[PDB]
Amino acid sequence: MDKKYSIGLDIGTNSVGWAVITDEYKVPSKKFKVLGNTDRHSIKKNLIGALLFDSGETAEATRLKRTARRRYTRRKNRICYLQEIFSNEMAKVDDSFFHRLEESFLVEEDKKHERHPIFGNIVDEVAYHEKYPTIYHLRKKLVDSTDKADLRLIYLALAHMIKFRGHFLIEGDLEITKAPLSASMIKRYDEHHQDLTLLKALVRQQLPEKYKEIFFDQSKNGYAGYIDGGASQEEFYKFIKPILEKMDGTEELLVKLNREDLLRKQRTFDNGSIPHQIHLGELHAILRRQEDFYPFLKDNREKIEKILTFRIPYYVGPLARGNSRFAWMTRKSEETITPWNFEEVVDKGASAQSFIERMTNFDKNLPNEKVLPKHSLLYEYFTVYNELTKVKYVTEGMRKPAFLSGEQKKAIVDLLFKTNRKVTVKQLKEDYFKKIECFDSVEISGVEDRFNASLGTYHDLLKIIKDKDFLDNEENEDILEDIVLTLTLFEDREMIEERLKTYAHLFDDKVMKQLKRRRYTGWGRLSRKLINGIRDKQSGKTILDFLKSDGFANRNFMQLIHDDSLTFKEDIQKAQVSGQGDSLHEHIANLAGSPAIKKGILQTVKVVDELVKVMGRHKPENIVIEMQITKHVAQILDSRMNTKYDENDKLIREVKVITLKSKLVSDFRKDFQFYKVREINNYHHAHDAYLNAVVGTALIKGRDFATVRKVLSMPQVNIVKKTEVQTGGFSKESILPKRNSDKLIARKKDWDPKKYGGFDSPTVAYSVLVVAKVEKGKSKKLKSVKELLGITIMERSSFEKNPIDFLEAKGYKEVKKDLIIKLPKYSLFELENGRKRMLASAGELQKGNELALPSKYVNFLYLASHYEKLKGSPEDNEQKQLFVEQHKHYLDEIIEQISEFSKRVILADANLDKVLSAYNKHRDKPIREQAENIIHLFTLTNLGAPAAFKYFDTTIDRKRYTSTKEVLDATLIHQSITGLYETRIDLSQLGGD
DNA sequence: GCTATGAGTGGCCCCTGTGGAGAGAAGCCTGTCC
DNA sequence: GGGGCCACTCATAGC
RNA sequence: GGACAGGCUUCUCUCCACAGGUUUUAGAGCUAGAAAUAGCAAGUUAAAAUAAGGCUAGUCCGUUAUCAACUUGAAAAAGUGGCACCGAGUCGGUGCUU
């Protein structure tokens, strides 16, 4: 016999609960076979459990980092182009100058040429640093001076301008000197110097004791920390404000501080508002000044100007040669794209059209067609004729509200739609019914004070074209629709002019000019072919044609597409693409929402599949779920379950799908006092799923209440933590100063971290158990070892490619290949007395046990927690308060059970003693305060990584397991997604000494 | 008589600020419809 | 939020 | 239940850019003193990297999504685990079957 049963599911963002119940609300328990090598061949478990998983992450960070990488690469390319231009003349003066510039980052030992970059000699370098303390001084000198200067200084100025060209927020162009920016920066530098001198003098004169801390201590927020340390400008002002208030003569300095102008640096974050035109002007001035000496400058002047001005248009996209999934550019010729010949290579119009169209939705009724623009004339025709199709009007002498004819529709559109941007009900009644039809009293139904459809595009074309006859000609419909498409697709005036150039023959200069200024945004939901492309086989009328005039039927779009006597429904059904059934992964990915809920849905579906496999492949009667997205989950479940068609090819619904809301179950809990505390454990998800299933089955349809109470008191529930292989950044991105340690990772292959510093704290991908021999001690004696080694994310490819060489690189010898066992994150281990630990990383463990607490304690805790906030009748409130007052001794029992559970699995003796001392010290506090503090206490034993918490005013820090050596002899557990299937492997029997 | 290793403990640490252009989805409000 | 790392004391044994 | 039409709000995906921050090196520190050190001077800028790198060599790609174990598979993927009853501190016992 197949015992009828149903599945209840609770779906969140981090957890998926599953419950299986029979017809009588009983939860069966089965005896399962256990694979492995241990003596435990059979384990009994209950058919209830919940799955926990890490929250899903979006793609924002990847997008930002990819954009940053592209920007850095393109800046490097600009610098390389500048150096390629200059190389010919630079070689004539100093051939090794470029070599010196590139290797300057290395230490003196690794440098191949002389250590001083600019000149290679100490005297000239000192002279340059003395005459020109800042690059802005050199910039102003080159702008104003009329003497032939060193080529290397010109290169430095041009490179400094190019590498920091500034923003492009504005198109077009925007001490009397042509370099206001450099002059302003030099003025700020001089003010900084003078103010620093004055500050030092005043501090030394009045308060000499603080001189050393302010001007020598790099560790504080003083001037030294503001310059050589990591102190920010705001922090420096914060620290220096009280000191200036303690001294005299600081009124000017204090006013400067209030304006954030005291001792201001040159390289400041306010530069984000500098237009690129200032840098362009300085560049052009320098080029003009120095072109009279260097022939190559004036010939390549426009190239240098373009390199600064050029940027890739955003609609074009990356200049990829086919092998990038993000690329869409159309490339005319296979030449190497350069900022000088960009115009002749890239089809700007085609690329822009591809960029716009690839995000446009396909027509749902006709998948192989694209929708029309929201401001398309044909779309506006469709909307207007659809609205006026169902309009009912009541005049004098009319018993029934009549329907408008096509002639009336055309007349009304011509009179008001083509003359008014929007047509209202009152305006219609006054202008057509009162004037044209000469009816004094007319009542219109279906439209609220204004028509939602309007001919805005027609009015724009009337304002611009100013020719009504050209607009009203059907022979122009193709040209007008193409014009509207062109206006919607592009935003660049140049491309708009280029494409409309073909139709410029029908219009004057000004008409073409104002057309170039119009833009439209938005798109419709139907395609051209659907509305007016396909024709009826008999009458030849399209959907639009019927909407214009349909006789007494006056059928709307929905009626036409569901009309059995017309071929529109036939064509729509025939056009349904019988494409490959989307893979459930990609099918779920096609949904709208955060990827986390998609992960939850996929896990839920796999849980359902495994449960069906467990129950002997006999499908349940009902599936209860709780969370459009819920509707899509229900659709997916129905599609996967009901798969057989009857003789009439109808859908055989062997399994019914149920959707429920949390409020009903919450009310059921409140009425029958089945309260839950979200902090005690994770069984609440399973209990909520069980309640969902029970309530659904009861609604569709003392024993039941007793059965529910018995079920909710079960201690054995299957909690499974889904293992995940960590991915992402190689390590923390904060570069740290050099230090003699083996834990640093180099930024580049040949950059020894001991001399350059680098990255720190790699993220562990996974660990593998290794049994081998390692030479330890000064005598290099072989020692057989057995330990866990964590593999970084950066080394995953090397490890997977050839594990043997990678392990030998670490010093391990005699590696037994078949003994390597991959252990993903959160792998489960079993210890003595049932104590369980989850492998968090290579060197840290997490608590892997769940506290089983009886229901009556949970009810008492809930009642005490909201003792003064009960929402119900006064009799119920007083009953609950009295019941709380009856059982004050439960607190001692709760503390005792917590102590026992801690002594059994937590092993936090110092923290447990602190907890006991705090509990004894605060035993006279109000009951509700006691409950509030005790609720926080369960964080100590909750599943997951240990965390700190507060108990009254005493704080208990987190207890961390800093050594994974105990699991080296434990029993490894592999659990299926529902945890019903297990495979247990004993690590102790492997790798004996 | 001296060191080395591991073992635990407590505490500190973690890249950030903005602009432009579009496309799409979803949640509410009104009207008509299948 | 949770894992990585450093400064410190200590356990413990080989020598 | 679904589709279209007007409005409010939030959220998601792709591209172009900018300003920083961090790191190493250069910017002769001087005086007295064996040195520890004491005093004085100065301090704003500059170059390169900004996930290791890869081959498809592009002015491209490298952090989202996908993953219990065993057999067959490059992988997507397919396949693999008795039942009923009585009990409950992480699940225990009893009866039939292979």
mmCIF file of all heavy atoms in Angstrom, chain D residues 48-59:
data_model
loop_
_atom_site.group_PDB
_atom_site.id
_atom_site.type_symbol
_atom_site.label_atom_id
_atom_site.label_comp_id
_atom_site.label_asym_id
_atom_site.label_seq_id
_atom_site.Cartn_x
_atom_site.Cartn_y
_atom_site.Cartn_z
ATOM 1 P P A D 48 54.171 55.904 -14.265
ATOM 2 O OP1 A D 48 54.051 55.866 -15.744
ATOM 3 O OP2 A D 48 53.186 56.677 -13.469
ATOM 4 O "O5'" A D 48 54.168 54.404 -13.733
ATOM 5 C "C5'" A D 48 55.105 53.455 -14.223
ATOM 6 C "C4'" A D 48 55.224 52.274 -13.293
ATOM 7 O "O4'" A D 48 55.766 52.711 -12.023
ATOM 8 C "C3'" A D 48 53.917 51.586 -12.931
ATOM 9 O "O3'" A D 48 53.518 50.644 -13.912
ATOM 10 C "C2'" A D 48 54.225 50.956 -11.579
ATOM 11 O "O2'" A D 48 54.925 49.733 -11.751
ATOM 12 C "C1'" A D 48 55.185 51.978 -10.968
ATOM 13 N N9 A D 48 54.530 52.927 -10.046
ATOM 14 C C8 A D 48 54.344 54.271 -10.247
ATOM 15 N N7 A D 48 53.757 54.887 -9.253
ATOM 16 C C5 A D 48 53.545 53.883 -8.324
ATOM 17 C C6 A D 48 52.960 53.896 -7.048
ATOM 18 N N6 A D 48 52.460 54.991 -6.473
ATOM 19 N N1 A D 48 52.903 52.732 -6.370
ATOM 20 C C2 A D 48 53.411 51.639 -6.954
ATOM 21 N N3 A D 48 53.983 51.499 -8.148
ATOM 22 C C4 A D 48 54.024 52.674 -8.793
ATOM 23 P P A D 49 51.967 50.287 -14.120
ATOM 24 O OP1 A D 49 51.850 49.471 -15.354
ATOM 25 O OP2 A D 49 51.179 51.537 -13.989
ATOM 26 O "O5'" A D 49 51.619 49.344 -12.885
ATOM 27 C "C5'" A D 49 52.173 48.040 -12.790
ATOM 28 C "C4'" A D 49 51.775 47.365 -11.502
ATOM 29 O "O4'" A D 49 52.355 48.078 -10.381
ATOM 30 C "C3'" A D 49 50.285 47.340 -11.199
ATOM 31 O "O3'" A D 49 49.617 46.274 -11.853
ATOM 32 C "C2'" A D 49 50.251 47.230 -9.681
ATOM 33 O "O2'" A D 49 50.467 45.888 -9.274
ATOM 34 C "C1'" A D 49 51.471 48.058 -9.283
ATOM 35 N N9 A D 49 51.127 49.448 -8.936
ATOM 36 C C8 A D 49 51.352 50.556 -9.710
ATOM 37 N N7 A D 49 50.965 51.677 -9.161
ATOM 38 C C5 A D 49 50.445 51.279 -7.942
ATOM 39 C C6 A D 49 49.880 52.019 -6.897
ATOM 40 N N6 A D 49 49.738 53.342 -6.939
ATOM 41 N N1 A D 49 49.462 51.350 -5.806
ATOM 42 C C2 A D 49 49.615 50.017 -5.783
ATOM 43 N N3 A D 49 50.141 49.200 -6.701
ATOM 44 C C4 A D 49 50.542 49.909 -7.776
ATOM 45 P P U D 50 48.115 46.458 -12.391
ATOM 46 O OP1 U D 50 47.707 45.187 -13.041
ATOM 47 O OP2 U D 50 48.057 47.718 -13.172
ATOM 48 O "O5'" U D 50 47.247 46.641 -11.068
ATOM 49 C "C5'" U D 50 47.150 45.597 -10.112
ATOM 50 C "C4'" U D 50 46.485 46.064 -8.842
ATOM 51 O "O4'" U D 50 47.244 47.149 -8.257
ATOM 52 C "C3'" U D 50 45.083 46.631 -8.994
ATOM 53 O "O3'" U D 50 44.100 45.612 -9.054
ATOM 54 C "C2'" U D 50 44.945 47.529 -7.768
ATOM 55 O "O2'" U D 50 44.589 46.767 -6.625
ATOM 56 C "C1'" U D 50 46.377 48.036 -7.581
ATOM 57 N N1 U D 50 46.576 49.406 -8.107
ATOM 58 C C2 U D 50 46.164 50.469 -7.323
ATOM 59 O O2 U D 50 45.637 50.333 -6.231
ATOM 60 N N3 U D 50 46.386 51.710 -7.864
ATOM 61 C C4 U D 50 46.969 51.993 -9.080
ATOM 62 O O4 U D 50 47.100 53.166 -9.431
ATOM 63 C C5 U D 50 47.375 50.844 -9.827
ATOM 64 C C6 U D 50 47.172 49.622 -9.325
ATOM 65 P P A D 51 43.348 45.269 -10.432
ATOM 66 O OP1 A D 51 44.324 45.356 -11.547
ATOM 67 O OP2 A D 51 42.107 46.079 -10.481
ATOM 68 O "O5'" A D 51 42.921 43.744 -10.265
ATOM 69 C "C5'" A D 51 43.891 42.707 -10.264
ATOM 70 C "C4'" A D 51 44.280 42.309 -8.862
ATOM 71 O "O4'" A D 51 43.098 41.991 -8.091
ATOM 72 C "C3'" A D 51 45.148 41.069 -8.729
ATOM 73 O "O3'" A D 51 46.516 41.325 -8.987
ATOM 74 C "C2'" A D 51 44.875 40.615 -7.298
ATOM 75 O "O2'" A D 51 45.668 41.349 -6.380
ATOM 76 C "C1'" A D 51 43.412 41.027 -7.109
ATOM 77 N N9 A D 51 42.471 39.893 -7.205
ATOM 78 C C8 A D 51 41.585 39.515 -6.230
ATOM 79 N N7 A D 51 40.853 38.476 -6.539
ATOM 80 C C5 A D 51 41.286 38.140 -7.809
ATOM 81 C C6 A D 51 40.892 37.117 -8.687
ATOM 82 N N6 A D 51 39.947 36.223 -8.399
ATOM 83 N N1 A D 51 41.509 37.040 -9.882
ATOM 84 C C2 A D 51 42.456 37.940 -10.163
ATOM 85 N N3 A D 51 42.911 38.947 -9.421
ATOM 86 C C4 A D 51 42.282 38.999 -8.237
ATOM 87 P P A D 52 47.228 40.684 -10.276
ATOM 88 O OP1 A D 52 48.342 41.576 -10.684
ATOM 89 O OP2 A D 52 46.167 40.337 -11.253
ATOM 90 O "O5'" A D 52 47.857 39.324 -9.736
ATOM 91 C "C5'" A D 52 48.884 39.334 -8.758
ATOM 92 C "C4'" A D 52 49.480 37.960 -8.578
ATOM 93 O "O4'" A D 52 48.450 37.040 -8.137
ATOM 94 C "C3'" A D 52 50.043 37.314 -9.833
ATOM 95 O "O3'" A D 52 51.353 37.759 -10.139
ATOM 96 C "C2'" A D 52 49.964 35.830 -9.508
ATOM 97 O "O2'" A D 52 51.036 35.445 -8.659
ATOM 98 C "C1'" A D 52 48.667 35.765 -8.704
ATOM 99 N N9 A D 52 47.507 35.428 -9.548
ATOM 100 C C8 A D 52 46.581 36.285 -10.083
ATOM 101 N N7 A D 52 45.656 35.687 -10.793
ATOM 102 C C5 A D 52 45.997 34.347 -10.722
ATOM 103 C C6 A D 52 45.413 33.193 -11.267
ATOM 104 N N6 A D 52 44.315 33.204 -12.023
ATOM 105 N N1 A D 52 46.000 32.007 -11.006
ATOM 106 C C2 A D 52 47.102 31.995 -10.248
ATOM 107 N N3 A D 52 47.745 33.011 -9.679
ATOM 108 C C4 A D 52 47.136 34.173 -9.958
ATOM 109 P P G D 53 51.884 37.726 -11.655
ATOM 110 O OP1 G D 53 53.316 38.111 -11.650
ATOM 111 O OP2 G D 53 50.927 38.473 -12.508
ATOM 112 O "O5'" G D 53 51.796 36.188 -12.058
ATOM 113 C "C5'" G D 53 51.639 35.802 -13.413
ATOM 114 C "C4'" G D 53 50.340 35.071 -13.635
ATOM 115 O "O4'" G D 53 49.228 35.918 -13.252
ATOM 116 C "C3'" G D 53 50.042 34.690 -15.076
ATOM 117 O "O3'" G D 53 50.691 33.491 -15.455
ATOM 118 C "C2'" G D 53 48.521 34.595 -15.099
ATOM 119 O "O2'" G D 53 48.090 33.342 -14.590
ATOM 120 C "C1'" G D 53 48.125 35.683 -14.101
ATOM 121 N N9 G D 53 47.743 36.959 -14.741
ATOM 122 C C8 G D 53 48.467 38.125 -14.712
ATOM 123 N N7 G D 53 47.883 39.108 -15.339
ATOM 124 C C5 G D 53 46.695 38.567 -15.800
ATOM 125 C C6 G D 53 45.654 39.162 -16.557
ATOM 126 O O6 G D 53 45.575 40.326 -16.958
ATOM 127 N N1 G D 53 44.624 38.267 -16.816
ATOM 128 C C2 G D 53 44.613 36.957 -16.403
ATOM 129 N N2 G D 53 43.534 36.243 -16.756
ATOM 130 N N3 G D 53 45.581 36.387 -15.704
ATOM 131 C C4 G D 53 46.588 37.243 -15.437
ATOM 132 P P G D 54 51.116 33.247 -16.982
ATOM 133 O OP1 G D 54 52.006 32.059 -17.023
ATOM 134 O OP2 G D 54 51.596 34.536 -17.539
ATOM 135 O "O5'" G D 54 49.746 32.865 -17.698
ATOM 136 C "C5'" G D 54 48.978 31.756 -17.254
ATOM 137 C "C4'" G D 54 47.694 31.636 -18.034
ATOM 138 O "O4'" G D 54 46.770 32.673 -17.620
ATOM 139 C "C3'" G D 54 47.826 31.821 -19.535
ATOM 140 O "O3'" G D 54 48.224 30.625 -20.181
ATOM 141 C "C2'" G D 54 46.440 32.304 -19.947
ATOM 142 O "O2'" G D 54 45.548 31.206 -20.078
ATOM 143 C "C1'" G D 54 46.018 33.124 -18.726
ATOM 144 N N9 G D 54 46.240 34.578 -18.869
ATOM 145 C C8 G D 54 47.230 35.288 -18.236
ATOM 146 N N7 G D 54 47.203 36.564 -18.493
ATOM 147 C C5 G D 54 46.117 36.717 -19.338
ATOM 148 C C6 G D 54 45.606 37.891 -19.945
ATOM 149 O O6 G D 54 46.025 39.047 -19.837
ATOM 150 N N1 G D 54 44.492 37.621 -20.730
ATOM 151 C C2 G D 54 43.950 36.372 -20.909
ATOM 152 N N2 G D 54 42.872 36.303 -21.705
ATOM 153 N N3 G D 54 44.422 35.268 -20.347
ATOM 154 C C4 G D 54 45.503 35.507 -19.576
ATOM 155 P P C D 55 49.299 30.658 -21.371
ATOM 156 O OP1 C D 55 50.219 29.505 -21.204
ATOM 157 O OP2 C D 55 49.856 32.031 -21.450
ATOM 158 O "O5'" C D 55 48.417 30.396 -22.668
ATOM 159 C "C5'" C D 55 47.210 29.648 -22.575
ATOM 160 C "C4'" C D 55 46.129 30.218 -23.458
ATOM 161 O "O4'" C D 55 45.871 31.597 -23.071
ATOM 162 C "C3'" C D 55 46.455 30.247 -24.951
ATOM 163 O "O3'" C D 55 45.261 30.021 -25.697
ATOM 164 C "C2'" C D 55 46.927 31.682 -25.160
ATOM 165 O "O2'" C D 55 46.805 32.162 -26.482
ATOM 166 C "C1'" C D 55 46.021 32.439 -24.196
ATOM 167 N N1 C D 55 46.564 33.734 -23.759
ATOM 168 C C2 C D 55 46.031 34.878 -24.343
ATOM 169 O O2 C D 55 45.130 34.743 -25.179
ATOM 170 N N3 C D 55 46.491 36.095 -23.989
ATOM 171 C C4 C D 55 47.462 36.190 -23.083
ATOM 172 N N4 C D 55 47.890 37.410 -22.759
ATOM 173 C C5 C D 55 48.031 35.038 -22.467
ATOM 174 C C6 C D 55 47.561 33.839 -22.834
ATOM 175 P P U D 56 45.339 29.554 -27.232
ATOM 176 O OP1 U D 56 44.213 28.623 -27.497
ATOM 177 O OP2 U D 56 46.733 29.118 -27.505
ATOM 178 O "O5'" U D 56 45.078 30.898 -28.048
ATOM 179 C "C5'" U D 56 44.438 30.876 -29.320
ATOM 180 C "C4'" U D 56 43.457 32.013 -29.475
ATOM 181 O "O4'" U D 56 42.353 31.820 -28.550
ATOM 182 C "C3'" U D 56 44.018 33.406 -29.189
ATOM 183 O "O3'" U D 56 43.415 34.361 -30.060
ATOM 184 C "C2'" U D 56 43.561 33.670 -27.758
ATOM 185 O "O2'" U D 56 43.443 35.035 -27.421
ATOM 186 C "C1'" U D 56 42.210 32.962 -27.727
ATOM 187 N N1 U D 56 41.815 32.515 -26.385
ATOM 188 C C2 U D 56 40.558 32.855 -25.933
ATOM 189 O O2 U D 56 39.768 33.494 -26.605
ATOM 190 N N3 U D 56 40.260 32.410 -24.669
ATOM 191 C C4 U D 56 41.078 31.683 -23.829
ATOM 192 O O4 U D 56 40.666 31.357 -22.716
ATOM 193 C C5 U D 56 42.366 31.377 -24.370
ATOM 194 C C6 U D 56 42.682 31.796 -25.598
ATOM 195 P P A D 57 44.339 35.310 -30.970
ATOM 196 O OP1 A D 57 43.446 36.134 -31.822
ATOM 197 O OP2 A D 57 45.381 34.462 -31.602
ATOM 198 O "O5'" A D 57 45.056 36.278 -29.926
ATOM 199 C "C5'" A D 57 44.361 37.385 -29.361
ATOM 200 C "C4'" A D 57 45.298 38.418 -28.780
ATOM 201 O "O4'" A D 57 45.985 37.862 -27.625
ATOM 202 C "C3'" A D 57 46.388 38.929 -29.721
ATOM 203 O "O3'" A D 57 46.624 40.310 -29.457
ATOM 204 C "C2'" A D 57 47.607 38.116 -29.297
ATOM 205 O "O2'" A D 57 48.848 38.720 -29.591
ATOM 206 C "C1'" A D 57 47.382 37.995 -27.794
ATOM 207 N N9 A D 57 48.035 36.835 -27.181
ATOM 208 C C8 A D 57 47.823 35.509 -27.459
ATOM 209 N N7 A D 57 48.554 34.693 -26.741
ATOM 210 C C5 A D 57 49.297 35.540 -25.931
ATOM 211 C C6 A D 57 50.264 35.291 -24.943
ATOM 212 N N6 A D 57 50.663 34.068 -24.589
ATOM 213 N N1 A D 57 50.815 36.354 -24.321
ATOM 214 C C2 A D 57 50.414 37.580 -24.678
ATOM 215 N N3 A D 57 49.515 37.941 -25.590
ATOM 216 C C4 A D 57 48.984 36.861 -26.189
ATOM 217 P P G D 58 46.353 41.408 -30.598
ATOM 218 O OP1 G D 58 46.161 40.690 -31.882
ATOM 219 O OP2 G D 58 47.395 42.460 -30.489
ATOM 220 O "O5'" G D 58 44.957 42.057 -30.185
ATOM 221 C "C5'" G D 58 43.754 41.679 -30.840
ATOM 222 C "C4'" G D 58 42.561 41.857 -29.936
ATOM 223 O "O4'" G D 58 42.577 40.840 -28.903
ATOM 224 C "C3'" G D 58 42.505 43.170 -29.172
ATOM 225 O "O3'" G D 58 41.962 44.227 -29.943
ATOM 226 C "C2'" G D 58 41.668 42.815 -27.950
ATOM 227 O "O2'" G D 58 40.286 42.800 -28.276
ATOM 228 C "C1'" G D 58 42.114 41.378 -27.683
ATOM 229 N N9 G D 58 43.219 41.302 -26.710
ATOM 230 C C8 G D 58 44.028 42.312 -26.248
ATOM 231 N N7 G D 58 44.924 41.896 -25.394
ATOM 232 C C5 G D 58 44.693 40.532 -25.290
ATOM 233 C C6 G D 58 45.348 39.543 -24.515
ATOM 234 O O6 G D 58 46.296 39.678 -23.735
ATOM 235 N N1 G D 58 44.788 38.288 -24.711
ATOM 236 C C2 G D 58 43.733 38.026 -25.547
ATOM 237 N N2 G D 58 43.345 36.746 -25.600
ATOM 238 N N3 G D 58 43.116 38.933 -26.278
ATOM 239 C C4 G D 58 43.646 40.156 -26.096
ATOM 240 P P U D 59 42.868 45.495 -30.329
ATOM 241 O OP1 U D 59 42.985 45.548 -31.807
ATOM 242 O OP2 U D 59 44.108 45.440 -29.515
ATOM 243 O "O5'" U D 59 41.991 46.745 -29.873
ATOM 244 C "C5'" U D 59 41.294 46.735 -28.636
ATOM 245 C "C4'" U D 59 42.247 46.854 -27.475
ATOM 246 O "O4'" U D 59 43.131 47.984 -27.680
ATOM 247 C "C3'" U D 59 41.626 47.114 -26.113
ATOM 248 O "O3'" U D 59 41.124 45.936 -25.508
ATOM 249 C "C2'" U D 59 42.777 47.747 -25.342
ATOM 250 O "O2'" U D 59 43.684 46.751 -24.892
ATOM 251 C "C1'" U D 59 43.468 48.560 -26.438
ATOM 252 N N1 U D 59 43.047 49.978 -26.438
ATOM 253 C C2 U D 59 43.601 50.807 -25.485
ATOM 254 O O2 U D 59 44.406 50.419 -24.652
ATOM 255 N N3 U D 59 43.176 52.111 -25.537
ATOM 256 C C4 U D 59 42.277 52.656 -26.430
ATOM 257 O O4 U D 59 41.994 53.852 -26.351
ATOM 258 C C5 U D 59 41.754 51.732 -27.386
ATOM 259 C C6 U D 59 42.148 50.457 -27.359
#
